[PDB]
Amino acid sequence: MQLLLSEAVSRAAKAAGARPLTSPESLSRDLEAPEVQESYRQQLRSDIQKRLQ
């Protein structure tokens, strides 16, 4: 379980062997924006309660 979407994507991009055309800092910055991170947090909470039942 990764709490931060930016960390999950960084690990997925490395695993997939893909590098951004912008920069990894610009990509992370975008994924660390409060709205997108919270959407990720709420999706996770939802999926956890789906596992729990």
**Given the rule CB under 8 A, which residues bind other proteins?**
1-3, 5, 8-9, 11-13, 15-16, 18-22, 26-27, 30-31, 35-36, 39-45, 47-48, 51-52
Is the separation of the CB atoms in 53 and 47 below 8 Å?
no
Minimum gap (Å) between residue 45 Cβ and other proteins: 7
Give one word for 19, left, alpha or beta, with left for phi > 0 and alpha for psi -120 to 50.
beta
Minimum gap (Å) between residue 26 Cβ and other proteins: 7
Contacts of 28 (CB under 8 A, 6+ apart): 6, 9, 10
Minimum gap (Å) between residue 34 Cβ and other proteins: 12
